[PDB]
Amino acid sequence: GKRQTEREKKKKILAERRKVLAIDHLNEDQLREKAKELWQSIYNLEAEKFDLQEKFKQQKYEINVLRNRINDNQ
Amino acid sequence: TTALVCDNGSGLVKAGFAGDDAPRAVFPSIVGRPRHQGVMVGMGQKDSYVGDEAQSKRGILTLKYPIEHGIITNWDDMEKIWHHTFYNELRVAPEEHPTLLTEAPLNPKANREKMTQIMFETFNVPAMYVAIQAVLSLYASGRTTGIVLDSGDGVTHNVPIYEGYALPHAIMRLDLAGRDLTDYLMKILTERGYSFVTTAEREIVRDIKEKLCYVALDFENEMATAASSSSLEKSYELPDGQVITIGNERFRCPETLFQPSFIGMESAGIHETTYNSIMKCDIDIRKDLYANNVLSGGTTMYPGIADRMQKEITALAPSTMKIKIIAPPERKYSVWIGGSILASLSTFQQMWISKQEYDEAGPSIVHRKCF
Amino acid sequence: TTALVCDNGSGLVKAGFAGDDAPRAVFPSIVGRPRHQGVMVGMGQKDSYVGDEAQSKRGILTLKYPIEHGIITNWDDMEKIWHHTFYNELRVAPEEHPTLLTEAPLNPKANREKMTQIMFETFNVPAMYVAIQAVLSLYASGRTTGIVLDSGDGVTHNVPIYEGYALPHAIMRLDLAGRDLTDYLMKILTERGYSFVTTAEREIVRDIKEKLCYVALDFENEMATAASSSSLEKSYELPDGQVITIGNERFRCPETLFQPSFIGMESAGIHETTYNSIMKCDIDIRKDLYANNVLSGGTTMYPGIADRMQKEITALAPSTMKIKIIAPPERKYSVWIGGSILASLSTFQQMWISKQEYDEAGPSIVHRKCF
Amino acid sequence: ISASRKLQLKTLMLQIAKQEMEREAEERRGEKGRVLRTRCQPLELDGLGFEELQDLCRQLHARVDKVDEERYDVEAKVTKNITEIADLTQKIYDLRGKFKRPTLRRVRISADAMMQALLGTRAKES
Amino acid sequence: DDIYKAAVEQLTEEQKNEFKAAFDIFVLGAEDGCISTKELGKVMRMLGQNPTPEELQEMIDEVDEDGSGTVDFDEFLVMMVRCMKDDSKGKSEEELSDLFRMFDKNADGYIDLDELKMMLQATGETITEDDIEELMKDGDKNNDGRIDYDEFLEFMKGVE
Numbered sequence A: 001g002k003r004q005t006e007r008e009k010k011k012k013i014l015a016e017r018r019k020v021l022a023i024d025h026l027n028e029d030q031l032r033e034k035a036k037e038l039w040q041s042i043y044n045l046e047a048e049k050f051d052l053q054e055k056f057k058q059q060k061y062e063i064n065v066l067r068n069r070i071n072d073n074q
Numbered sequence B, C: 001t002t003a004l005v006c007d008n009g010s011g012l013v014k015a016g017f018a019g020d021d022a023p024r025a026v027f028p029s030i031v032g033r034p035r036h037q038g039v040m041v042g043m044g045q046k047d048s049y050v051g052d053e054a055q056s057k058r059g060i061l062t063l064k065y066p067i068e069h070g071i072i073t074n075w076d077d078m079e080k081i082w083h084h085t086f087y088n089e090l091r092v093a094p095e096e097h098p099t100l101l102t103e104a105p106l107n108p109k110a111n112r113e114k115m116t117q118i119m120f121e122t123f124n125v126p127a128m129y130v131a132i133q134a135v136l137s138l139y140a141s142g143r144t145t146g147i148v149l150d151s152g153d154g155v156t157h158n159v160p161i162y163e164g165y166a167l168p169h170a171i172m173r174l175d176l177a178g179r180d181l182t183d184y185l186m187k188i189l190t191e192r193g194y195s196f197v198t199t200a201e202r203e204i205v206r207d208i209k210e211k212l213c214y215v216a217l218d219f220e221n222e223m224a225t226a227a228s229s230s231s232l233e234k235s236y237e238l239p240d241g242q243v244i245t246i247g248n249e250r251f252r253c254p255e256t257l258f259q260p261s262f263i264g265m266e267s268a269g270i271h272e273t274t275y276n277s278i279m280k281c282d283i284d285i286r287k288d289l290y291a292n293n294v295l296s297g298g299t300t301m302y303p304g305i306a307d308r309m310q311k312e313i314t315a316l317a318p319s320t321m322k323i324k325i326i327a328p329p330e331r332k333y334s335v336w337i338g339g340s341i342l343a344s345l346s347t348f349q350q351m352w353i354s355k356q357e358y359d360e361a362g363p364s365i366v367h368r369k370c371f
Numbered sequence D: 001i002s003a004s005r006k007l008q009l010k011t012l013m014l015q016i017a018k019q020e021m022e023r024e025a026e027e028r029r030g031e032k033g034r035v036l037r038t039r040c041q042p043l044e045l046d047g048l049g050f051e052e053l054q055d056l057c058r059q060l061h062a063r064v065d066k067v068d069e070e071r072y073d074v075e076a077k078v079t080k081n082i083t084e085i086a087d088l089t090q091k092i093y094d095l096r097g098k099f100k101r102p103t104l105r106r107v108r109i110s111a112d113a114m115m116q117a118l119l120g121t122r123a124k125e126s
Numbered sequence E: 001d002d003i004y005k006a007a008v009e010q011l012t013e014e015q016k017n018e019f020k021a022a023f024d025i026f027v028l029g030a031e032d033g034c035i036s037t038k039e040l041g042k043v044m045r046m047l048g049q050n051p052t053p054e055e056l057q058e059m060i061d062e063v064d065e066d067g068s069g070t071v072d073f074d075e076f077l078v079m080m081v082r083c084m085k086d087d088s089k090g091k092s093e094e095e096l097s098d099l100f101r102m103f104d105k106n107a108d109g110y111i112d113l114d115e116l117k118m119m120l121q122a123t124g125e126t127i128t129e130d131d132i133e134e135l136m137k138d139g140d141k142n143n144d145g146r147i148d149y150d151e152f153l154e155f156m157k158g159v160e
Ligand SMILES: Nc1ncnc2c1ncn2[C@@H]1O[C@H](COP(=O)(O)OP(=O)(O)O)[C@@H](O)[C@H]1O
Pocket: B008, B009, B010, B011, B012, B013, B151, B152, B153, B154, B178, B179, B182, B206, B209, B210, B211, B297, B298, B299, B301, B302, B332
């Protein structure tokens, strides 16, 4: 169930990174706080995505280096 | 961009870009986990050697083919083989290349649907198309008619085609192929004292079969000659010395093709299933099929088979028809050459199963109009 | 910190810090209580002289080795030897240093468990690991394959290894070693008149064996030559004068290795147990084992053994394979050099048996994953 | 000449490279911070009607879910790259293991202690 | 040892005479001022030690640039201080790999002579092109105009 595992993990993340949200029974201050929670969560996700981009750049560079070393080794 | 013409096969995976003459990378399709314990630390020992790497470390592995008879029995290993083929033998990411797999006739549907689902979800190709392994071998010969006998290593199938119109009611698929001949050779070698048991030694018996065996023109005369003289005994050096001498096992191993009663199979040989496949066709296209009999696949490379088969069919067929057997020297890669030609056509460029189509109808799209 | 690479052995204890070229302190493993009465008062006479001190006062001691054949038969004496090794020959308290003992293959479990229990309770080391004496000798050669014949002084064992994967079903352990050769030499010296009986004179016979004996390339020709000429008779001066002359006892003592019928043992020589150990391996790694036969251990230092063994194996093996015998000049300390290399590896740094693990599972932890 | 001055040159090169790497990393951190501050839309959480606040919060939650999906996809891609480069490193070791193991240097026994013992205090270097 | 050698290197040439006097205090009878295997073995035996002559000749050959197997006066000092070992682990492999990866500005997986020139210009230390040539020779083993990662390790081997 590996592909099913990935799909279910993603769907859970939809319900995990975003829990059950009810903005109707909350006062103005609580709504503002929850909105800022969403905003800062998105900011953290942007930070993580940027980190992933940097790591991917490093991975590509090192992969090229390893290809060169492998070619040299023969 | 260019298309990837992969050809899973069973025994040798042949792949390469569309539009060339020969496959770029040809390597056995075996995945072998190590079986002993391993004491050296830091040696960098992997958990599974696939492809041609496991034909060099086969002394301490347990090789196991992921494709039994055309069908695929172990999907994880097949996925591993495909991943190796794409990334290490061709070094082209599949995100930017259409693929053209090949499949034997009369195979289970679930196999084909799982194949397309893997290609679209895991490797995430732009578009893939599945083609019957015999039509390609007919492409490579440059014909447009003819009945092709594609005796691979997994399964032998015999698809007749006329004027481009395939005859679906005349396909005769038989499950005797190169692997059963290897097992039978390994079983008759025991009559001289040589015992091969390990799954690694099956490769040695396969090499013996490839290098020494040949198909006899007349079976009884050869059996009588090999039992009196000694002009047939050819010797062969094992991977460690101790040469062996093969006597009348030379032409008895591939004789199983024409007498499947040797390995206990009921059906008739490849010399008579072709005639039966012809006789199921209409009465007016039998002359053309008689004159354009095509051989393909690896197992039809035995020295002297294109004469034995012609003699047998001429015995069966009416005396007036001319029997001709097309045996191109590039028999082994005939299916892949045909696949390259088909993928290089402009008229074929709109038959691919585009990814958006798969997203709308699911994996069952392959049985639909996009065949 | 640095690791202590101790190597108990049987006959010479070799120890030293990890990462060097040679063991720091090498000394015989004998513990000898005095046997006479003793009349001088206040001379400071101890109750047991161990190590190299008892090879100088051996005239009035009764030396007794605490390790018979790999296994340890007298645990108190072995504890005394270890205590001496740690405190006086290296002068490093064991409370701050990991230890890497070595053990012959196929030894009793209780020996290994008692060894780890002693190291953890009495000396209270931080972490200790037990390794098979042949894998280290394979490390020292810088190989990763090969079949190593480690003919020590206690026991001769022959462990084949391929690509880092040890073959546990092909280990052939034989209990003929240097000690039996010393006893046989002491027994055949009596044919000229020289009688050595005392356990102290066994050391003199050992010195004779080390300095004079050599392995004959062809046994019968040497027996015929030594019986006609006198070009072989080499003389040797005892610790008190009265030189002795060794005739054809020179190459008859180490010949016992290739014909264990001399000392009444049934089994085949070290020239044929290697071939048997190879033939038990798989058919595809026999060429590599043939080409990378490794010698180690002290007893393989006889002048002319690397040629006799190669001649014998070439006689046994198929004519096509190439037989090569690796005999490095640093044979005696090969196991310890390999031990130093293994202890200096970064990948190995997490395989030690940490003390908290022993506290949770008892001494039987050694048979578990931490081997 | 000797390798002492050459070793000094090499160490100077090493120090310069380390300084440049640290400087580049600091620049990357600052640029990343500024870019991240740019990416996320600023909050406007004043003077908004209660129902309007709820609707805006729901829109923010939807966008958060979208970003969660996107970043999960990117994380999966980077994970695949990590696995693939780990396999590449495995192959690198396979082609570079064997005999290529660095060895320690312990063949020299202690020499300073013997020098001090046999010459008193005349050995002052070590 | 090597660190102490570099530290004391800032003194005058009379320290060489002091070390010769110390070696005379050890094994008086020296006449050439060079440590051969004979004198080294004799002094270590007097100390109660025995280093292998193979180690001594390997140390001789490692610093041997002209291939003479002998030592000049400063080369004699280098050989004398080679009798002890202190450079353990050679700085740090990971950081060195990071520096070498940052060296490749064009990210071609190699370091060419031009990149070496740029880095040396960035260093600014008083250098001559002869030093650059020596560095390139010691770094580019195969003389392909580039530095391999294995060749980079060999060039940075035993380097802190
Ligand atoms: N030169 C040869 N002579 C005889 N048999 C061969 C020869 N080459 C291949 N074969 C047999 O054919 C098999 C390969 O068939 P192949 O056409 O690769 O199968 P597939 O259709 O799966 O690609 C091998 O297993 C071998 O037994």
